[PDB]
Design an enzyme around this catalytic site. Structure first.
Site, PDB file in Angstrom:
ATOM      1  N   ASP A   5     -27.145  71.561 -16.839  1.00 40.83           N
ATOM      2  CA  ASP A   5     -25.780  71.049 -16.762  1.00 40.83           C
ATOM      3  C   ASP A   5     -25.787  69.547 -17.043  1.00 40.83           C
ATOM      4  OD1 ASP A   5     -23.265  70.053 -15.907  1.00 40.83           O
ATOM      5  OD2 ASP A   5     -23.018  71.794 -14.589  1.00 40.83           O
ATOM      6  N   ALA A  58     -20.849  74.931 -10.628  1.00 45.04           N
ATOM      7  CA  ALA A  58     -21.146  73.613 -11.183  1.00 45.04           C
ATOM      8  C   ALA A  58     -20.190  72.579 -10.596  1.00 45.04           C
ATOM      9  CB  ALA A  58     -21.024  73.645 -12.706  1.00 45.04           C
ATOM     10  N   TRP A 109     -11.873  69.122 -14.333  1.00 45.71           N
ATOM     11  CA  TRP A 109     -11.270  67.982 -15.026  1.00 45.71           C
ATOM     12  C   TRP A 109     -11.634  68.049 -16.509  1.00 45.71           C
ATOM     13  CZ3 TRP A 109     -13.018  64.139 -18.178  1.00 45.71           C
ATOM     14  CH2 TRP A 109     -12.207  63.002 -18.344  1.00 45.71           C
ATOM     15  N   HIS A 126     -22.636  73.187 -18.376  1.00 47.22           N
ATOM     16  CA  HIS A 126     -21.583  72.983 -17.389  1.00 47.22           C
ATOM     17  C   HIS A 126     -20.461  74.008 -17.558  1.00 47.22           C
ATOM     18  CE1 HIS A 126     -19.410  70.814 -14.361  1.00 47.22           C
ATOM     19  NE2 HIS A 126     -18.420  70.481 -15.169  1.00 47.22           N
ATOM     20  N   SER A 166     -16.469  72.851 -11.324  1.00 49.83           N
ATOM     21  CA  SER A 166     -16.547  71.392 -11.433  1.00 49.83           C
ATOM     22  C   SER A 166     -15.658  70.682 -10.407  1.00 49.83           C
ATOM     23  CB  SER A 166     -16.159  70.967 -12.855  1.00 49.83           C
ATOM     24  OG  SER A 166     -16.356  69.575 -13.052  1.00 49.83           O
ATOM     25  N   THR A 167     -14.725  69.859 -10.882  1.00 43.77           N
ATOM     26  CA  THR A 167     -13.818  69.152  -9.982  1.00 43.77           C
ATOM     27  C   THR A 167     -13.106  70.150  -9.073  1.00 43.77           C
ATOM     28  OG1 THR A 167     -13.406  67.282 -11.478  1.00 43.77           O
ATOM     29  CG2 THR A 167     -11.718  67.757  -9.818  1.00 43.77           C
TER      30      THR A 167
END
Lengths: 275, 274, 275
Positions: free
Chosen positions: A226, A121, A30, A255, A96-97
């Site tokens: 992160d 992450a 995201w 991140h 991430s997302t």
């Protein structure tokens, strides 16, 4: 290229490499797009793979549909891309997302015999606070992010990558305007609505159940510095919950390490994939 | 607008002006798009022409196809655009890599009786050093560019326009954030793979043969301070290989002179074209 | 999404919210796109409205058609969007040039009984100085903008938002690079020819006739420090010409107030719409 989902959404995707080469499907975070994977796409192309990366609904070049911004829809959109290209059995990499999207996809779409998965992450198991996850961050932080997306998205999308995302706010760290701008750029072409709801999707979705059911080899890569997704509360715990998960820790990494430390990440990613 | 090539590639293009007005087809450089021609497009529209400019495959808004990133495919893509619009017999203007594209197109598609051509800071005859081209640049330089595109494209696409491309690195010259940003922008919307392969396409393709066979009038424009495409090993040689070619040297001008010295370049282009 | 006009132009648009919810159609200014309405779109979605915003021809993601860059065509394009979505009777909000587009639409397309309209820092009645409009700006001002678009567009699109557009050039006002870059971005993806001609369309079109014929309730919003569209020769006069129009003055506000003062503009827009 584009594929139309069952619910009428146009999902944009990149598909590079020999049609019959082993596949790696990349899932962005995201509020980015498939463009966030440049370094990985070229690296894996150069190492014999067919690489696929799509834009999440309402992100990048995909249609700015106003609803269905939840992990289940994200996962079904993945299913649409996979079936469209006939890339079942591919290795799935999520940042991430995108890591949440990968996990939810492997949970609700077991018919696709995914070979291996890599979570970089990633948000799982859960970022929001609940009685079951007392270590989850308070919504006030997320509600706040939604407010930023709704009232000053242009500047907010400069602040995030210029500060915490890539660790450019750390002492002695030289920032890259090109990298900051590209993050910002990918965010601005996406839907403010999709990004707004998207925060609820990646912060308030519990992936604990999904992680427990995944039996395939899964590598979890997480930087201990992160500032966006908790190293321990997300990364370490995710590796622990995954029956065949393995943890790869990167000291001091941010991140956005797949971008700022592409060499290291790609080498380790390849080593895992080749078993 | 888009045209679908024979091999399934979607090529984006701009087409402005009266349908029946004389045509000038502009070909952009690496790693940009048709958007790089803004100043020229409006200038020539104001001077009675229909102007056409397309995005090279994997560049700008065209399909991010993973292969076919070579001059032959670039030229056949031009053929698709030309046929789709029925603009045979037009004048073709190419900048940098675009100049090589124009030359290869004319060579592979003699059926199109192109009126004239203009090569601006163009890559022909051959940029890299070889046993046949001792004056070229060592391949390592281009390998370096490829490495940058592969691992830090976002910053590299800032470094080039902020430094050598427009001569902004020359002490005393005032840089334009808008111009730098627009260069970077066009680059980032394109395919990293297309750009990666595109370097080999523009620096290691020999256009000598194509040049020797072009009989139409051709104007070769080149700044003598071009930090991207060496003046001595490109423009000077191309003009001499072209049977009806002529060289126009601009003292102190950078590679991106069509943007930073539009008035002068547009005036000279018009004098040759009209 | 896209709709094809009678004359073959592809008009890009955003359509968010419940299909059966009350509609608000937003019309952007020069040389931007529907992306300029982010703050407004999310605010009204939150208040239960369905929101629609399209990119003017040759702007943003719409076709870079070389001709038809005038108010009549802009208005007919609006008609194509409305018919395509079946959103007749909606409320229409236009900013700057978009204000002119709204008024011309309501004038040549009476079949669509628009509920209400809002003109924010809108160009009507007529910007340029003429014998009938001696209080306008000399045409030379607009000729200057055209010359900038033709020979220095990339930088000119940084200068406008970094200076007069948002009032960032006023003493003590801190600029937002994100907001400046987003303005620049929307401009660069649009057609230089469309923008060049568009200057004539917004500055030299007289909307007096259209204004006198609009019987619906109309709110005219205008900041008195608007450096792009002079307050005294626009909003003040437009409000008086509209039989059921009213002026809302924002002391010290810039041309881009919907962005830099979203909270205030949104609240006032909502109050008026539900009035």
């Amino acid at each position: 290229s584009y594929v139309t989902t069952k619910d009428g959404v146009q999902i944009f995707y990149k598909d590079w490499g020999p049609r019959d080469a082993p596949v790696i499907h990349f899932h962005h975070g995201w509020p980015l797009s498939a463009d966030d994977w440049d370094a990985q796409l070229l690296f894996f192309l150069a190492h014999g793979y067919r690489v696929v990366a799509h834009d999440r609904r309402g992100h990048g070049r995909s249609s700015q549909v106003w609803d269905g911004h939840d992990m289940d829809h994200y996962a079904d959109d993945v299913a649409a891309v996979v079936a469209h290209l006939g890339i079942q059995g591919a290795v799935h990499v999520g940042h991430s997302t995108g890591g949440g999207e990968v996990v939810r996809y492997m949970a609700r779409h077991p018919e696709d015999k995914v070979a291996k998965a890599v979570l970089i992450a990633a948000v799982p198991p859960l970022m929001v606070q609940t009685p079951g996850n007392p270590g989850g961050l308070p919504k006030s932080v997320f509600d706040g992010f939604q407010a930023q997306v709704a009232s000053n998205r242009a500047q907010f999308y400069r602040d995030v990558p210029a500060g915490p995302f890539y660790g450019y706010n750390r002492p002695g760290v030289e920032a890259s305007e090109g990298i900051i701008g590209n993050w910002w750029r990918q965010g601005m072409i996406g839907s403010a609505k999709a990004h707004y709801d998207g925060i609820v999707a990646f912060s308030q979705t519990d992936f604990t159940e999904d992680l427990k059911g995944i039996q395939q080899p899964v590598l979890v890569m997480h930087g201990d510095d992160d500032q966006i997704v908790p190293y321990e509360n997300s990364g370490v715990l995710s590796a622990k919950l995954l029956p065949n998960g393995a943890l790869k820790t990167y000291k001091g990494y941010p991140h956005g390490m797949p971008t700022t430390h592409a060499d290291v990440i790609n080498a380790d990613l390849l080593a895992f994939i080749r078993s």
